[PDB]
Amino acid sequence: SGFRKMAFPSGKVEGCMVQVTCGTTTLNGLWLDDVVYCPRHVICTSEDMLNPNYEDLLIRKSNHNFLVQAGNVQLRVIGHSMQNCVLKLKVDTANPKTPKYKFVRIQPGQTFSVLACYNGSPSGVYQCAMRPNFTIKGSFLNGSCGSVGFNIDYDCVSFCYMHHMELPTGVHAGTDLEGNFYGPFVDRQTAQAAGTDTTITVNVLAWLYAAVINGDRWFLNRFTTTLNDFNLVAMKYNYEPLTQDHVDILGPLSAQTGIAVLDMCASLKELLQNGMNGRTILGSALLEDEFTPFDVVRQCSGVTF
Amino acid sequence: SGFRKMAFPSGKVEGCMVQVTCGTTTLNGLWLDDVVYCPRHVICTSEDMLNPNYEDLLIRKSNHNFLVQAGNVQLRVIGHSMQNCVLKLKVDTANPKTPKYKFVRIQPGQTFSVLACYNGSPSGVYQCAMRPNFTIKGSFLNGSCGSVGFNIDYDCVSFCYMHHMELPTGVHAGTDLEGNFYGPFVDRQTAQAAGTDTTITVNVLAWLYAAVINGDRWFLNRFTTTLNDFNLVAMKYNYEPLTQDHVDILGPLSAQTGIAVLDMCASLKELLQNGMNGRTILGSALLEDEFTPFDVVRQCSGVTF
Ligand SMILES: *[C@H](CO)C(=O)N(c1ccc(C(C)(C)C)cc1)[C@@H](C(=O)NC1CCCCC1)c1cccnc1
Numbered sequence: 001s002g003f004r005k006m007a008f009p010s011g012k013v014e015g016c017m018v019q020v021t022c023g024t025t026t027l028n029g030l031w032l033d034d035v036v037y038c039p040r041h042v043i044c045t046s047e048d049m050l051n052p053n054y055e056d057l058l059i060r061k062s063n064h065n066f067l068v069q070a071g072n073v074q075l076r077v078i079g080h081s082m083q084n085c086v087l088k089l090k091v092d093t094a095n096p097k098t099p100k101y102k103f104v105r106i107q108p109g110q111t112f113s114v115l116a117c118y119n120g121s122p123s124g125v126y127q128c129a130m131r132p133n134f135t136i137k138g139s140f141l142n143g144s145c146g147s148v149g150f151n152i153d154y155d156c157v158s159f160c161y162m163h164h165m166e167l168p169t170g171v172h173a174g175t176d177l178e179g180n181f182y183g184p185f186v187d188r189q190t191a192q193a194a195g196t197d198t199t200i201t202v203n204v205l206a207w208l209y210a211a212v213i214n215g216d217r218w219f220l221n222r223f224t225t226t227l228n229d230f231n232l233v234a235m236k237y238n239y240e241p242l243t244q245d246h247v248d249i250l251g252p253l254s255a256q257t258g259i260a261v262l263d264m265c266a267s268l269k270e271l272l273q274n275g276m277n278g279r280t281i282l283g284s285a286l287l288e289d290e291f292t293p294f295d296v297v298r299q300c301s302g303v304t305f
Numbered sequence: 306s307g308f309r310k311m312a313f314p315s316g317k318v319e320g321c322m323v324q325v326t327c328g329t330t331t332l333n334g335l336w337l338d339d340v341v342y343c344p345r346h347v348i349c350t351s352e353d354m355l356n357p358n359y360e361d362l363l364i365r366k367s368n369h370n371f372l373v374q375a376g377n378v379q380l381r382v383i384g385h386s387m388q389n390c391v392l393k394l395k396v397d398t399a400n401p402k403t404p405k406y407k408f409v410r411i412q413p414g415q416t417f418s419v420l421a422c423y424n425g426s427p428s429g430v431y432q433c434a435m436r437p438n439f440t441i442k443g444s445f446l447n448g449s450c451g452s453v454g455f456n457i458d459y460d461c462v463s464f465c466y467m468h469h470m471e472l473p474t475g476v477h478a479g480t481d482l483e484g485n486f487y488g489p490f491v492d493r494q495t496a497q498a499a500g501t502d503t504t505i506t507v508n509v510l511a512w513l514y515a516a517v518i519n520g521d522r523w524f525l526n527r528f529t530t531t532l533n534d535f536n537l538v539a540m541k542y543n544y545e546p547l548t549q550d551h552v553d554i555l556g557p558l559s560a561q562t563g564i565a566v567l568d569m570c571a572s573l574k575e576l577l578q579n580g581m582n583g584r585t586i587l588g589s590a591l592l593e594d595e596f597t598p599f600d601v602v603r604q605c606s607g608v609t610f
């Protein structure tokens with residue numbers, strides 16, 4: 001029993017983190033096979049950051065300008081290219097620790113684990129979600145640039161995020177491993193504001209199922225509702241609208257608890273309209289929305305890797 | 306910026322987890338050097354659990370009754386002994402992945418990372434605290450037995466917890482790596498109730514410093530108080546009493562924020578007496594007490610390992 005903010009084990013991603021220095025700037029890179037992946041703004045200076053032209057900045061850069069260290073050893077850079085907003089630095093040695101892996105571009109509402117790194121070394125691991133405004137609410141300091149977000153299905157690490165920057169509001173922006181940003185953000189020091197941070201309704205519902213599974217049932221009400229009627233209340237509270245796919249995805253949790261999804265929606269609606277009255281649910285006084293219906297299943301079933 | 310429930314990187318402990326089976330029962334073990342550590346109730350049956358005599362049960366057990374697997378390989382058990390509530394299984398091969406390590410018995414209020422395992426394989430990692438009633442609020446299912454809790458200072462893993470059992474209230478009990486339980490619990494299936502779960506005051510205060518550091522300042526009030534006067538309000542709210550050592554330990558955070566500890570106490574007292582008015586602090590609507598004054602420092606300074 002119990003229910004925690006649980007991240008995947010970080011070992012397989014730990015053995016991938018390197019340090020990339022280009023002239024003055026040092027951030028983290030991701031070493032898979034014979035390529036090192038890192039944010040392209042590694043080539044930027046103090047002067048370049050408001051308005052950088054990355055192609056022009058790359059003319060003045062050769063293989064030997066990129067210093068890549070793995071622990072105490074240097075790696076020889078035999079080729080470099082820019083794919084969207086990441087640099088791919090070909091090195092002459094395959095990473096012997098390279099795990100099985102995929103690159104995947106996640107949807108808003110999906111969760112992943114972040115291994116926060118500084119100077120190529122890991123500091124800690126934690127779980128977060130791609131928000132519907134395509135930010136993530138991370139824990140990142142200067143130099144965390146190039147840390148990666150990932151899921152693990154059994155043996156296979158599917159990397160889904162690379163950390164690029166912090167916005168003035170303290171939230172975080174980044175790219176997939178092909179260098180395409182999530183949402184509208186760009187790797188320049190220019191006014192960039194997040195859109196509305198709406199709540200991931202399906203994730204809230206899945207977390208409510210996890211509470212029932214753990215014995216926290218006081219919020220189970222005597223009502224049901226409809227998809228259309230719930231969404232009227234949801235949009236008023238800046239909840240993401242619930243779809244039939246969301247219902248279908250909650251099916252396994254429906255089945256395990258004996259509680260129909262639409263009944264769970266009426267319970268959520270009552271919690272939204274009346275508050276939590278200083279009670280808690282699974283140790284929280286907020287409706288937690290960063291657990292997916294696969295997250296609860298895994299944690300409440302013990303799926304290993 | 307940002308502030309998350311951050312665990313240490315789990316890689317070094319991952320490479321230590323094995324599977325221990327004794328007759329019918331299978332749980333996790335910890336393989337450091339040529340010894341495997343695991344909970345002694347691995348030798349218990351369905352019939353033994355209300356009242357087991359572990360010495361009598363050990364008479365009927367020899368080296369070859371303990372099946373220890375690391376992945377797909379078996380380890381040869383050349384000797385076994387019981388130290389308090391753990392078994393130490395001497396095997397004929399040193400773990401080549403053995404990290405630098407210490408065994409430490411933590412104090413209530415201290416935090417650590419848990420690598421939750423099933424059948425010797427890791428499922429996820431998360432952070433928790435030794436509560437003042439000597440329970441921990443974990444995420445553990447059947448078979449998680451033998452998972453370990455740990456801190457990492459740079460290169461050195463100091464293991465501090467091994468998971469033994471769940472109490473009927475859904476919280477968790479366990480031992481240090483010498484097999485002495487935390488608090489009064491015993492490895493039998495018998496009525497065991499937790500004492501009062503009081504709040505770790507110093508950890509709440511440290512978390513308030515982390516909010517200020519991150520820009521969340523609305524709770525900074527216009528008061529100060531004294532140690533004695535704060536504790537009058539603290540004991541009413543089942544907060545642990547604050548000492549001068551707690552003050553001294555908060556000193557680095559005092560210095561970094563410009564906010565005296567005793568002023569921070571008056572702010573906490575106001576939050577305790579008046580509530581949070583539906584506001585949040587660092588994304589929480591509860592006063593979070595599972596971050597120590599070393600935790601905030603590390604996360605708000607980027608200490609790597
Ligand atoms: C990256 C490693 O130095 C880094 O920490 N970082 C950052 C700096 C500069 C950029 C440019 C794209 C502008 C070159 C990108 C990332 C900082 C950061 O994001 N600072 C921004 C700069 C613009 C205004 C808001 C803050 C950083 C700090 C903490 C966490 N992540 C990133």
Ligand SMILES: *[C@H](CO)C(=O)N(c1ccc(C(C)(C)C)cc1)[C@@H](C(=O)NC1CCCCC1)c1cccnc1
Pocket residue numbers: 001331332346349354445446447448449450469470471472473491492493494495
């Ligand atoms: C250990 C691995 O099987 C395990 O999960 N577990 C457990 C069972 C039995 C014991 C004895 C000491 C009684 C032999 C210890 C641990 C269960 C568990 O703790 N069940 C208890 C048994 C007594 C009443 C309350 C539940 C477990 C389940 C989830 C998380 N941790 C442990």
